[PDB]
Structure 1
Amino acid sequence: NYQPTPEDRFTFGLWTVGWQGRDPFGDATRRALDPVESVRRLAELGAHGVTFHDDDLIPFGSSDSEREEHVKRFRQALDDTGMKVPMATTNLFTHPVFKDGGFTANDRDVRRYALRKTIRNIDLAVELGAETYVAWGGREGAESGGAKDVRDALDRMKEAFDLLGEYVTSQGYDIRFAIEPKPNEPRGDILLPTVGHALAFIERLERPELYGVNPEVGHEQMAGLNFPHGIAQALWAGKLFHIDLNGQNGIKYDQDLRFGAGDLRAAFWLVDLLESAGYSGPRHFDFKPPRTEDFDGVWASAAGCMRNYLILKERAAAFRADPEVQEALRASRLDELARPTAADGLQALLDDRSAFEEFDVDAAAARGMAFERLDQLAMDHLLGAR
């Protein structure tokens, strides 16, 4: 019955199940959760691990003895449960000092503090076992056109990430960075707003091999984009270092619904792609149990994230295994798409009369693609109606 186990590599942020329910129109509906309790409860649900922002684990402004005690308690819970910490990140968005950004704040002193706050937490992440360090620049951007020179900001962003790469290299760490794009919210427009913009930026870093993306389902959908397509481009580029799973109903505020909610068909095609491609990273849920829920509803929502992934994994596997689907894929020429267009080379293509002077455009145009029957087989499999 679709029970998750640690082999599935499902992970959750402390800030997910720990979200107290504050929204901009509403006060908290749930009391604060001790990270120790979250580790224990998530382990009981079959999770593989947890993730954290610095400020989720160590209250901002803590002394060293407070910091040590908070980390000690968390480590003890990890050791007790066997839960891993595959990824961590920096909170460079909540505190008022970051109201104009961290790495791209107009004020240089804030930019430097943001880097120092990040570097301190990279050390802690490595200590606790993280393989990926995520950066979500939620405050990098603007509400008005004059407030941020984006060319200068990209220079500052490159400088920051280059320094972080120099740091991890100098320390001999194996951890790598994953940039998490988002188009807007909390800023009117956020810099590096989609997977594409982040991938493009990475190519201009000094050590691009150290950086990939951490795409989030709902974020790309807030720009109306096809999340499986974006993941495909990230995989094509060798840059899918981590992924954030949740649900979103199209173009509106960032809903962070449990995975499977929002665009269910997109969730199906996403799981099909991750499993087919052999993605081996964490299946991380960056979601919020709605503020209508008590703690029983928190754990039900987290359990649902994993359950929906596993149902979709079964259905996508059954789809790909079905001989009738394999036939429909051939009927739609998915096999031909994987063949090189012109491995014979440019000169041969130019000399091939069948490619132009003798090409029967009307006969080619008459061929149906058979995509509707293929998609109805996919629907039948998703719904278990085969």
Structure 2
Amino acid sequence: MNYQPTPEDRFTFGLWTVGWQGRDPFGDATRRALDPVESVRRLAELGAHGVTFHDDDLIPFGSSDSEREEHVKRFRQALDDTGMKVPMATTNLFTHPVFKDGGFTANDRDVRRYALRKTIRNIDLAVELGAETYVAWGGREGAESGGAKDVRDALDRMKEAFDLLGEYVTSQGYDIRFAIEPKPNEPRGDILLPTVGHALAFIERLERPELYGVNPEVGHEQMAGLNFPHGIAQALWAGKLFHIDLNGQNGIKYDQDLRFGAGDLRAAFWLVDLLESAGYSGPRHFDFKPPRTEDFDGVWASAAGCMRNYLILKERAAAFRADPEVQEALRASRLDELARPTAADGLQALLDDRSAFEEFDVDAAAARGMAFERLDQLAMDHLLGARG
């Protein structure tokens, strides 16, 4: 009867989430900047396992090698004081005006080289802090108009960039993998590699595909009206779910980054059911923005809400799968048959099987109800805790 998170739950937060000051396209900040050290302390008290960062969240852009050292030192001391881990790090290749046309796929060659150098420097830092995953979100890679970007040339530049980071990591002997985070649009009119599918496809064209996977975000796939759990299943099927960003989103519109559980509640249930049943072992990272209507107390309530909502859904999904009535319904809907090979007997035997065509009774097969509605209502009852 308790939903208290503990570090063993592997809940993580970006510094930029609880640290979001509330500046939006139409308004000024509503909260003061949070010292990352304070963020780490508050999060550890809430039961979090660790934090993530962009280089620019930790070390202000333009810091001298000296101030940099100082900023890392204070951070490192907060991690030691709290026991918090840093499992993932990423680069800010979107805020500074130089990246207005992108980082790895900017038309200007000198900016692409700078983007790489900036990233490489942060990869060194990430390894030192113990991160296992390095995320790349190409927020500025894309266009508002068609002639501004030749997409085939942009994809060559993107592959070139990732191949170089792969050569770097391998030459240094680092134990770290990359994860590409898709987003369909915003802040560019259209962004390259807009969905999980596009990113997965792109990865197979890299020189060392085994080094790269995806970091899908609930809200981003939903901005394209796609089914998030289905996209995650395809990533898992491919062996490419290296990390995940959890949050909420209310349909096709701007990127909301609501707390996890908010937005599409049923999709959140099916997502938890899948992550737990597939045995996803990575961090449960929250990339959310406490709404700008909130003061600091609302910020911490929002973060606690993300973890609470995950734990409640995990309990409901587990009760759903453990329910014998549900196991019976799953067999009535033939989920058991879906998992059996269609033709382990082989092509030849299938061609010779008259029961597969010549003598197949299509009419009888057609008449068989799938019983999906009863199964779905059983799932609803479990979610709402209304199971008899």
DSSP-derived class of the 2:43 partner: helix
Cα distance, 1:53 vs structure 2? 0.1
Cα distance, 1:197 vs structure 2? 0.1
TM-score (norm 2): 0.99
Give RMSD over aligned pairs: 0.3
Cα distance, 1:248 vs structure 2? 0.1
Q: Cα deviations across residues 264-315 of structure 1 (Å, max 9, x unaligned)? A: 0000000000000000000000000000000000000000000000000000
Q: Cα deviations across residues 76-109 of structure 1 (Å, max 9, x unaligned)? A: 0000000000000000000000000000000000
DSSP-derived class of the 2:148 partner: coil
| Correspondence for 1:204 | 205
Cα distance, 1:257 vs structure 2? 0.1
- Counterparts of 1:307-346 in structure 2, within 5 Å, are 307-346=308-347
Structure 2 distance, partners of 1:355, 1:89, is 53
Count matched residues. Answer: 386
Structure 1 distance, partners of 2:94, 2:356, is 55
Structure 2 distance, partners of 1:269, 1:104, is 36
| Correspondence for 2:23 | 22
Q: Cα deviations across residues 38-94 of structure 1 (Å, max 9, x unaligned)? A: 000000000000000000000000001110111000000000000000000000000
Structure 1 distance, partners of 2:22, 2:265, is 24
Structure 1 distance, partners of 2:265, 2:71, is 38
Structure 2 distance, partners of 1:26, 1:322, is 49
Structure 1 distance, partners of 2:113, 2:371, is 57
Q: Cα deviations across residues 321-349 of structure 1 (Å, max 9, x unaligned)? A: 00000000000000000000000000000
| Correspondence for 1:292 | 293
DSSP-derived class of the 2:101 partner: coil
Cα distance, 1:147 vs structure 2? 0.5
Cα distance, 1:8 vs structure 2? 0.3
Q: Cα deviations across residues 232-259 of structure 1 (Å, max 9, x unaligned)? A: 0000000000000000001000000000
DSSP-derived class of the 1:310 partner: helix
Cα distance, 1:202 vs structure 2? 0.1
Structure 2 distance, partners of 1:120, 1:79, is 23
Structure 2 distance, partners of 1:335, 1:39, is 46
DSSP-derived class of the 2:179 partner: strand
| Correspondence for 2:86 | 85
DSSP-derived class of the 2:147 partner: coil
Structure 2 distance, partners of 1:53, 1:122, is 11
Q: Cα deviations across residues 25-47 of structure 1 (Å, max 9, x unaligned)? A: 00000000000000000000000
**Structure 2 unaligned spans of 5+:** none
Structure 2 distance, partners of 1:177, 1:226, is 24
Structure 1 distance, partners of 2:183, 2:195, is 6
Cα distance, 1:156 vs structure 2? 0.2
Q: Cα deviations across residues 210-234 of structure 1 (Å, max 9, x unaligned)? A: 0000000000000000000000000
Cα distance, 1:166 vs structure 2? 0.3
DSSP-derived class of the 1:134 partner: strand
Structure 1 distance, partners of 2:147, 2:302, is 42
Q: Cα deviations across residues 152-205 of structure 1 (Å, max 9, x unaligned)? A: 000000000000000000000110000000000000000000000000000000
Cα distance, 1:384 vs structure 2? 0.2
Structure 1 distance, partners of 2:335, 2:285, is 30
DSSP-derived class of the 1:146 partner: helix
DSSP-derived class of the 1:86 partner: strand
Structure 2 distance, partners of 1:70, 1:296, is 26
Structure 1 distance, partners of 2:352, 2:249, is 50
DSSP-derived class of the 2:146 partner: coil
**Structure 1 unaligned spans of 5+:** none
Structure 2 distance, partners of 1:257, 1:129, is 28
Structure 2 distance, partners of 1:129, 1:380, is 42
Cα distance, 1:354 vs structure 2? 0.4
Q: Is 2:137 aligned against 1:123? A: no
Structure 2 distance, partners of 1:227, 1:260, is 13
DSSP-derived class of the 1:123 partner: helix
Q: Identity of paired residues, percent?
A: 100
Structure 1 distance, partners of 2:150, 2:74, is 44
DSSP-derived class of the 1:99 partner: helix
| Correspondence for 1:262 | 263
| Correspondence for 2:241 | 240
Moved over 3 A (4+): none
